[PDB]
Structure 1
């Protein structure tokens, strides 16, 4: 059989080196690279309305510091980042269209994930 097996690439590595690295470069990334700072924008309600916060900053730390059990867990944190943003903001805001753009892209990049 001259057909050799398709290359075995790790999923979480791909998440760091490919998925995250793409989202991070993108022009709309900056509001998601650190946590939402609810002091410095006047919003003392943020932390009551958002159960469990999330950002690419934290996802990056986690990929770099052996946090994630499996690639499923890392994806959860991405979804949670977006869904946090859609809840706490009023649809058709600017933050929401930026998040919708990063999500469209996210789902492209996830679809080409290895196995």
Structure 2
């Protein structure tokens, strides 16, 4: 009956690089998703103690949120842009896992997923 620690966002032993793709994910993708009207329930880890949701972290064993993604990009925690896209995908599917098809929170995450996909269509070439 206690929230887990948030996901790690710093990995100081890992090599670091800046790519056009990683910079785009932070400066465009994360930015556009953050300001969407549906974003706030996904911006921080679910606070299951505050919400009185004792089952959340019994069901969700790989939590992910947009605040954690932002910090990872800022700390060059990702070497490959797909590791970041995976975290985004984990955040959406965590919503589909915890809730039920057609739920309103799920319709919210679905709309955010469509926008995320629209944005990564414009991802700069890996070059």
TM-score by structure 1 length? 0.90
More helix by share: 1
Q: Match for residue 44 of structure 2? A: 34
Q: Do the aligned partners of residues 7 and 113 (structure 1) sit closer, same or farther apart at CA in structure 2, a change above 3 Å counting?
A: farther
Q: Do the aligned partners of residues 39 and 14 (structure 1) sit closer, same or farther apart at CA in structure 2, a change above 3 Å counting?
A: same
Per-residue CA distance 1:70-105 (angstroms, 9 max, x = gap): 101000000000000001011221111110000010
Q: Do the aligned partners of residues 95 and 16 (structure 1) sit closer, same or farther apart at CA in structure 2, a change above 3 Å counting?
A: same
1:87 aligns with 2:97: yes
TM-score by structure 2 length? 0.81
* Contact 1:54–1:80 (Cα < 8 Å) also in 2: yes
2:29 to 19, 42, 51: 19
How much has 1:2 moved relative to structure 2? 44
* Contact 1:9–1:114 (Cα < 8 Å) also in 2: no
Q: Which has the larger radius of gyration?
A: 1
Supply the RMSD in Å over aligned alpha carbons. Answer: 7.8
Where does the alignment leave 5 or more consecutive residues of structure 1 unmatched? none
Give the number of aligned pairs.
Answer: 115
Q: Match for residue 68 of structure 1? A: 78
Where does the alignment leave 5 or more consecutive residues of structure 2 unmatched? 1-10
* Contact 1:62–1:68 (Cα < 8 Å) also in 2: yes
